[PDB]
Amino acid sequence: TTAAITGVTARAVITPMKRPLRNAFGVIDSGPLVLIDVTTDQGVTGHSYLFAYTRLALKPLVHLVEDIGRELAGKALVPVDLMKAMDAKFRLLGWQGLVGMAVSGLDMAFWDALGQLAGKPVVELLGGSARPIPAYDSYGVLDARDDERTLRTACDEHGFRAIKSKGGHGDLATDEAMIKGLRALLGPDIALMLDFNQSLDPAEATRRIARLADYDLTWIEEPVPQENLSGHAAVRERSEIPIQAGENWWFPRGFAEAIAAGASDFIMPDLMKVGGITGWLNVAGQADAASIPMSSHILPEASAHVLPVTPTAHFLEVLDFAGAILTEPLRVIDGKVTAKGPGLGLAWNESAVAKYQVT
Amino acid sequence: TTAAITGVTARAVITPMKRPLRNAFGVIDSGPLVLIDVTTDQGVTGHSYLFAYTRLALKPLVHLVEDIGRELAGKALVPVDLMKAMDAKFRLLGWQGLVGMAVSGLDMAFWDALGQLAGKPVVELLGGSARPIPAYDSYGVLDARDDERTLRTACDEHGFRAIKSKGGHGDLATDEAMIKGLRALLGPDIALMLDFNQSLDPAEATRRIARLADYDLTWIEEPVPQENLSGHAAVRERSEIPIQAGENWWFPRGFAEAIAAGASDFIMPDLMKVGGITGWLNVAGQADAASIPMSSHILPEASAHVLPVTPTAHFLEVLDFAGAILTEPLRVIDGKVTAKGPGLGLAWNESAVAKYQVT
Amino acid sequence: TTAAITGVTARAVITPMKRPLRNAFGVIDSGPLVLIDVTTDQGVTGHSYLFAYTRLALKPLVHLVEDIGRELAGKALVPVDLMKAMDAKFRLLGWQGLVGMAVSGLDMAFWDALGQLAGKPVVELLGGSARPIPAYDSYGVLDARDDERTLRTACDEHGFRAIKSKGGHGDLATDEAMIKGLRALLGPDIALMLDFNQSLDPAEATRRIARLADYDLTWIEEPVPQENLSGHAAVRERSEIPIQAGENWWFPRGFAEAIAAGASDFIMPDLMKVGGITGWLNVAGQADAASIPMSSHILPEASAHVLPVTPTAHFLEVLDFAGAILTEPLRVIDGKVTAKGPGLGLAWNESAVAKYQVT
Amino acid sequence: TTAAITGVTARAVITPMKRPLRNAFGVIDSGPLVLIDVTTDQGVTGHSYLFAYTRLALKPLVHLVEDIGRELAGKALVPVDLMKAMDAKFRLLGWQGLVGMAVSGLDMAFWDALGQLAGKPVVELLGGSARPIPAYDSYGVLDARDDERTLRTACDEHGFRAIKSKGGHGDLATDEAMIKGLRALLGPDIALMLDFNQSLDPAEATRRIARLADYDLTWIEEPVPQENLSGHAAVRERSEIPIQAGENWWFPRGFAEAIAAGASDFIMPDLMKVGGITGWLNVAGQADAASIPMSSHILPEASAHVLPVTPTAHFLEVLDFAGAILTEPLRVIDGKVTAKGPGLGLAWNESAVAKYQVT
Numbered sequence A, B, C, D: 001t002t003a004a005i006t007g008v009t010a011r012a013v014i015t016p017m018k019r020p021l022r023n024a025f026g027v028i029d030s031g032p033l034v035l036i037d038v039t040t041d042q043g044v045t046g047h048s049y050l051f052a053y054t055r056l057a058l059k060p061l062v063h064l065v066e067d068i069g070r071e072l073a074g075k076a077l078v079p080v081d082l083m084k085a086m087d088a089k090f091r092l093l094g095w096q097g098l099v100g101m102a103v104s105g106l107d108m109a110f111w112d113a114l115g116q117l118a119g120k121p122v123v124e125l126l127g128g129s130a131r132p133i134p135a136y137d138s139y140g141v142l143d144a145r146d147d148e149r150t151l152r153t154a155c156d157e158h159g160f161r162a163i164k165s166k167g168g169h170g171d172l173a174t175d176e177a178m179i180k181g182l183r184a185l186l187g188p189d190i191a192l193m194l195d196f197n198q199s200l201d202p203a204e205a206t207r208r209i210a211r212l213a214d215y216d217l218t219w220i221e222e223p224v225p226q227e228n229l230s231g232h233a234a235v236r237e238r239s240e241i242p243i244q245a246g247e248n249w250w251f252p253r254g255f256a257e258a259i260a261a262g263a264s265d266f267i268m269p270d271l272m273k274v275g276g277i278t279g280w281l282n283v284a285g286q287a288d289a290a291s292i293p294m295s296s297h298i299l300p301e302a303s304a305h306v307l308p309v310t311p312t313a314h315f316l317e318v319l320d321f322a323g324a325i326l327t328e329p330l331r332v333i334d335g336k337v338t339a340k341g342p343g344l345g346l347a348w349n350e351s352a353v354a355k356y357q358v359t
């Protein structure tokens, strides 16, 4: 018969980062994470993690995961049914925001558990195969001089053929100087993406984008606030560079309304906000219908399991917040990433967890 | 290690039908089926079947399945990857029509095999659970007087709370007489659906639908030709009764274009034409985004395995063409249908297959 | 000289409710609230409260309010600037959901402190006057027989000329019987509103609304999920009854996108989710441009201060969660509510707080 | 304890101007103003002024201000309520045009009185702070040769980083030669705006704007008549330079229709035509929803109090008609303008008023 959930625990950690990532709104210089364990009555504990953005989110997210989780004891391990139940539970309060991250975190852990119980990676459960997905190396604001060694190692050693950096921290001249430097340093055969992290308004985005058009950029990411779907659509209409967005939209319905608005050319759901594996698969069918190339936002380990069954799969984003607390950290080979199992391939390095844990 | 396909065989049968199903275009008085077996190297053979509509399609379908199957020998049993390969293979010739039915038939048999290999129903592989799905009993043209015994049995014994019949064979008076008779016999608490089988043009469909709105119909199905998405949309715009369609549209893209045109209020894909299980799941995401209740068209055994994971699941259509040749025929309990495994719950009663096989 | 914030504290309480409020998704039989205090350097502490929906949200919300407030300590008490600050702080994480309720709770407390500092009700600070706003009495599921006495009291003692109840818990017959009984009991000159609390899909909402059209309802509230803007709009297009929504949308952009999609005929923002007073005022300008009548969702004490400066002000919803812990609980006179100051008129009954506090 | 209005008086003056402002329709070489005084019963007199465009409007505006004011005797000083009363009073006759300017002038004086009564600048009453707003220096037709000294002072001494000039007075070659000369004199890092003052039709606007594309203009202002919203939208859709407009539109509804038509990329309401402070606040909500950057049209003293609470605040226009008759004339520092109080910071230099008064 089917495994049942027996308990749920969540722990907060703050991991270190070598590359401090400056963005238009400030700097992320550590990895605040929430580590989720779903125990079963069949000798398996499912695992997933959330990137929490800021230390302030950790305590609330832990309360949520554990309080939602407690009510799941005794329930059959059936992700689709569990997702429907969480939907009903939070219908009135709202599942956008921290609640939805807890819900998506739990979903990933349920699927990880199912994978473990079967001795297979999640990607095989989903009817696909674990194969190399094109990846890009995701940075904060870069400087072609100061960061040359790092970028050399990325492209030469790890084989990356795509790099993303950040802009909107200053004026247009600052963005242009950065991109011009990068394009000169990396040459014409490396893809370059630019992420504004929601920092512009539509008129200013249109203006900057037109002035960056000569650097052969692959996409412009979140040019304006994520909630501003109409403003994204306006920028998209006038842009000669594809518009990428989605990492901050909530659940399959959030994607359905963005697509209805025509907000972007590309999407990149975040597994923590799209409703975990279950919600991702829904959106994959939406993106196929809309002919929208679909990439992932961080959570590279889990994202590697869903991109191979995504009809319009595009890029996997490499930004490694969790490696320090994982038994088997992400590996990039020849600029690509392959899913690792069983489950999602998330098992904790407990000595490191103990070191970086916070309460 | 993942199973590989070793071979594919297809057999044609014509099963007997208790009651002839008269429609606007003719009569279906038997069940021309293609039974598909996909042998693997792990002691399991995946099964699925196609309803072929007419005996004329049997030989061509057998050939196509065997020809395509032969080319898949040695390949890993990975439904998503196999579907992508079949897509590329038929991109130029086209996979609408008989080729598409072959392709979808193969896909169902692959998932069936995965389920058998796991010892689980396909629905559990898909992250859902096998649970009772509301069903309706699907008839040809009915006559309340002549068909009372059958309808009493359907409602009183099998617990059906919804009945579908056919229209468009004659004039509007004929349709109205039929429906009025049925509604008087069955009372207000049984759902009634009406299927025109593509027999009207948009102006006539609009005219008939307005005159039938007093009988509290649940839906009007395929009022005009299935290819006529614009015509469906025009009927839908003017109709006070929900418009149902989709059993004849091809693959996830066929649904994406229909939805983009606003062809219908409800949809009911056929697993044989939507791209099997793999195609169905894509369309389930689209239907959720469009807020379109999604039902099934025939193939009730396999349909029972995908409706439980379909966000907008509506009705399962019960029309039993295959019962005669299955080891475990479809069961209806209290007007609902529950998925049976392992796999899709499709294993052949060989003595019956021998009896009804045509060559 | 402008006051500065010196600290922020939040306390959780669960207040008793005389009458349970059954809705389509469950029952609210208590008032889990978060009471917010913002101390200033000018002898005034600003107050606001949040209705938290479920006890599960209380600890995380208290954490968020205190943690955000800690970071505002030392800033000038300038609500427009503080809101810009909070926007930038949560731009990446997201301010939908619990975070947004904390942000809006803080905003209301800032304006409450300003009013206290001036010795004026907030409404006069906003260039308006404290004057009676039409109100309706907001119930759970009602039964005209069982609840005759309560409704008589509401109409005769408090002068209500409008009543709202809930539906969608069961089938259409149940909704119709409830509304039919209420219209028969109350007669044609009492306004009746029906709230589905997001429980239907668009097709089913359209079907039920058409059947309820003869009861002369004032509005149908949240017929489908709040996130489903395109779905609301599809319902609105087909509905002969005005569609009301908004109590679950986030900040002025959430309203801008809903209005752009044509989701509803009426709106009713919740001060906890629209961005407090500061967010409300922005939406008031949007609703004026769109000619959308604008009512409030709960928080009647604070809502009384903003409706008098809302160009399209419609109704104030009376649902009294907080009276138990207020020094001056809400009063309804002749079916209307008048704003009370100074500030928002929220000061705590500390003995009651001590009684109902939960930790 | 709310102040009541006791009387209203208005005086006409014609102030001298340093240099003529030539535009496509004529020359403004003086400042015909209406100075408005609202006396209250609490020892404060509210002040505002109108720019009247032409001496012909002075007598009628004085008449209207005094006649309307006379009917406000004894009314409570509540701007939102007074605006609604003025709306009802002029609904039939119409409040577009001279009546609307008198109405908006009164509103500004009411807010100024409230700020004076509180001992605070209006911006602080509105929940914002007095902070520097980026400004541009607003000229008539310029010649880079003849006007070099004036423009060097503007950019070097006063720190302006943005300059606006007028076009449409002759043919396209004239506009182009002028812009070319200005761009050469000012260099790349000074913003340049061009105001056609409604002098073109849409086809001619489209033709001229395309020819001015290479001069890096910030905006093209009122390319066609202000009432021609459809014509503005057509220019906007074809224009590669942002279209600015709005200085001549009437009240929040005038903006709502222009925004609904998609008339412009940017707007710049005139406090005299938008409905004073009260109407400006409504339109600020609209511009936020539409993501439209919002600047001011003249009345720089009062505009400095509302731009700080305008979510999409863009530029403050510096054109100083009133400095001659103010106790504290506008000050520009480092190309920015900061609100001064109390009230709107408008108090009259009575000896100057006497010198420039016309009767």
Ligand SMILES: [Ca+2]
Residues within 6 Å of the ligand: A195, A197, A221, A222, A247
């Ligand atoms: Ca990003």
Ligand SMILES: [Ca+2]
Residues within 6 Å of the ligand: A235, A236, A237, A238, A239, A240, A241
């Ligand atoms: Ca584009």
Ligand SMILES: [Ca+2]
Residues within 6 Å of the ligand: B195, B197, B221, B222, B247
């Ligand atoms: Ca059919």
Ligand SMILES: [Ca+2]
Residues within 6 Å of the ligand: B235, B236, B237, B238, B239, B240, B241
């Ligand atoms: Ca229709």
Ligand SMILES: [Ca+2]
Residues within 6 Å of the ligand: C195, C197, C221, C222, C247
């Ligand atoms: Ca409600």
Ligand SMILES: [Ca+2]
Residues within 6 Å of the ligand: C235, C236, C237, C238, C239, C240, C241
């Ligand atoms: Ca309607």
Ligand SMILES: [Ca+2]
Residues within 6 Å of the ligand: D195, D197, D221, D222, D247
């Ligand atoms: Ca102008």
Ligand SMILES: [Ca+2]
Residues within 6 Å of the ligand: D235, D236, D237, D238, D239, D240, D241
């Ligand atoms: Ca344009």
Ligand code: NI
Residues within 6 Å of the ligand: A059, A063, C059, C063
């Ligand atoms: Ni805690």
Ligand code: NI
Residues within 6 Å of the ligand: D059, D063
């Ligand atoms: Ni006169």
